[PDB]
UniProtKB/Swiss-Prot annotation, chain A:
GO terms for biological process: negative regulation of defense response to virus; negative regulation of mitochondrial fission; positive regulation of autophagosome assembly; symbiont-mediated suppression of host cytoplasmic pattern recognition receptor signaling pathway via inhibition of MAVS activity; symbiont-mediated suppression of host type I interferon-mediated signaling pathway. SUPFAM superfamilies: SARS ORF9b-like. The open reading frame (ORF) encoding for this protein overlaps with the N ORF. It is found in: Host cytoplasm; Host mitochondrion. It comes from Severe acute respiratory syndrome coronavirus 2. Plays a role in inhibiting the host innate immune response by targeting the mitochondrial-associated innate immune response. Acts by binding to host TOMM70, inhibiting its binding to HSP90AB1 thereby disrupting the interferon activation pathway. Keywords: Host cytoplasm, Host mitochondrion, Host-virus interaction, Inhibition of host innate immune response by virus, Inhibition of host MAVS by virus, Inhibition of host RLR pathway by virus, Viral immunoevasion. This is ORF9b protein. The keyword Cell cycle does not apply. Changing residue 1 to S: In strain: Omicron/BA.1, Omicron/BA.2, Omicron/BA.2.12.1, Omicron/BA.4, Omicron/BA.5, Omicron/XBB.1.5, Omicron/EG.5.1.
Swiss-Prot record, chain B:
Residues 1-74 form the 9b domain. It comes from the Viruses. Changing residue 54 to E: In strain: Gamma/P.1. This is ORF9b protein. Plays a role in inhibiting the host innate immune response by targeting the mitochondrial-associated innate immune response. Acts by binding to host TOMM70, inhibiting its binding to HSP90AB1 thereby disrupting the interferon activation pathway. Disulfide bonds: none annotated. Pfam families: bCoV_lipid_BD. It comes from Severe acute respiratory syndrome coronavirus 2. One of its GO terms (molecular function) is protein sequestering activity. CDD domains: SARS-CoV_ORF9b. Belongs to the coronavirus group 2 protein 9b family. The lineage of its organism: Viruses, Riboviria, Orthornavirae, Pisuviricota, Pisoniviricetes. Keywords: Host cytoplasm, Host mitochondrion, Host-virus interaction, Inhibition of host innate immune response by virus, Inhibition of host MAVS by virus, Inhibition of host RLR pathway by virus, Viral immunoevasion. The open reading frame (ORF) encoding for this protein overlaps with the N ORF.
Amino acid sequence: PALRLVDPQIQLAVTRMENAVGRDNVGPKVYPIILLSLNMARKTLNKAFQLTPIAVQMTKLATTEELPDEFVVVTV
Amino acid sequence: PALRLVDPQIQLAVTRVGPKVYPIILRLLSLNMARKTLNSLEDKAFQLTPIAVQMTKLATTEELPDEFVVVTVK
């Protein structure tokens, strides 16, 4: 009931073990995201985790022409 | 509420340049791979494929990697 394209700066890397010796060989690939908060994290002190938020800009879609040939849907 | 280590086979690629990938962790849904594939003679339809999202409950915080991302649902 709600659709929008996540800015290409953020894409999902996907892998499937089940189709290694099975297929042929799907690899690890990055795919755009179609649709909360997110934070990128790092180690600082002895156990401490710094994090900074990354702003996810999205573009609302209207035409199916905007939809690429390979992407990933994520529902909320 | 505990955090969830997301399947490392599923990792987030951040470019914003330095394109690096990071594990995903969850604070508290579905996932659909979408390819064209469906040929036909005039127009190409879309093949959807749900992927199994296998999360594991995190034991100790020492298990966390030095670089990762956290996503919040509600």
